[PDB]
């Protein structure tokens, strides 16, 4: 249908214009206007752990996203399976909170 072809072109133009608009504003800032002639330390792994926890939970959420779009088709069996999955996720979350791995302040 011409509708899907039209929407394909519209999406492409929107993306090209959006990124083009940002570049235009940036290149304008660079050109428009005058200009004057003119190791020992590290961050705590608490930053990594938050990111690592995010990665693990985000990958776990992928399965729940696929289930969400197909809950009725999967039926109650699927519900029981997802329930076990969510329980394991919550159990690990409880472990992280109880071991204090989820408290920014010491």
């Amino acid at each position: 249908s011409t509708e899907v072809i039209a929407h394909h072109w519209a999406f492409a133009i929107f993306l090209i214009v959006a990124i083009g608009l940002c570049c235009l504003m940036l290149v304008g800032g660079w050109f428009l206007g005058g200009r004057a002639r003119a190791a020992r330390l590290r961050l705590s792994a608490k930053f990594y752990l938050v990111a690592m926890f995010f990665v693990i939970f985000d990958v776990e959420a992928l399965y729940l996203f696929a289930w969400s779009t197909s809950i009725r088709e999967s039926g109650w069996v699927g519900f029981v399976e997802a329930a076990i999955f969510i329980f394991v996720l919550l159990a690990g979350l409880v472990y992280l909170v109880r071991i204090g791995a989820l408290d920014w302040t010491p």
Binding site: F14, A18, C23, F47, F54
Partner: protein, 320 residues
Amino acid sequence: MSWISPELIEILLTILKAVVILLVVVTCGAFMSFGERRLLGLFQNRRVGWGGSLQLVADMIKMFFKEDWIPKFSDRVIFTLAPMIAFTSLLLAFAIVPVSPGWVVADLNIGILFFLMMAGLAVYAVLFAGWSSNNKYSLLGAMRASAQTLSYEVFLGLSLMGVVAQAGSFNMTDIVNSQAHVWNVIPQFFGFITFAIAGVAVCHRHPFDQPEAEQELADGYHIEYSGMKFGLFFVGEYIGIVTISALMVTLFFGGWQGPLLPPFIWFALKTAFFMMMFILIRASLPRPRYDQVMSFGWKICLPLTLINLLVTAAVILWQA
């Protein structure tokens, strides 16, 4: 009109409508920046143009004609890319928002998944800004803000899984058509609350702004940015608020479904209410401690989103 064909005009009118949506969104975000500043002043009991409306235009001219500057010891590519990501992340996510019947840039099957894809890439703006700045203190602030975001980006999608479950689809139009009778604000209330909390956190708006307040060794990932590059982050935030607001309308408030006013008017009406709801929130909300925001995202919102989805599934399968 010789080359013009009934099909060509369809593939031309559609492109025009998409450009219109893009322009209106960027305009709305910029205007809100001004509209807010003024309203906040009214709340605090305190002009360039019509009610100060031209202040927005004045700022743009100043930022455009301001000397552009990249720190001598800063990765130019990463330093320049950060503002770009901040501006062209949630803006691209608006392609899935159906503003009215016959007005949607992209009716994608992935639907809401596209917003999550763009929201996921937005974190790099904060990280790249901090690393490129070359300011040790900026890096710490960027890392604090990035960790805060991931603590809210974790349940962002899960907050919308109850809506997807009821609709049985990620397509936004299907989600709107599924709110014909009852808007998802009522059945998926916990989802609405959690999504709102995550959405403002993703847009780095109050109270998830200033994540470097407690640390004296942290400054901010915008300290070295100046001129348009500094403005791109500011505008990006407001464009993101508009995108989130328009998603809430589409996901929890029936989208353009309203009793009498034209469909588009409803969409705007509701989106404006959400855009101003965030404004009421900014004034009437004390900023919690970095520790509190980190804990609230992992210990309260994440569990709740996981429970809402399971309960929604039980009710759906029971009614079937």
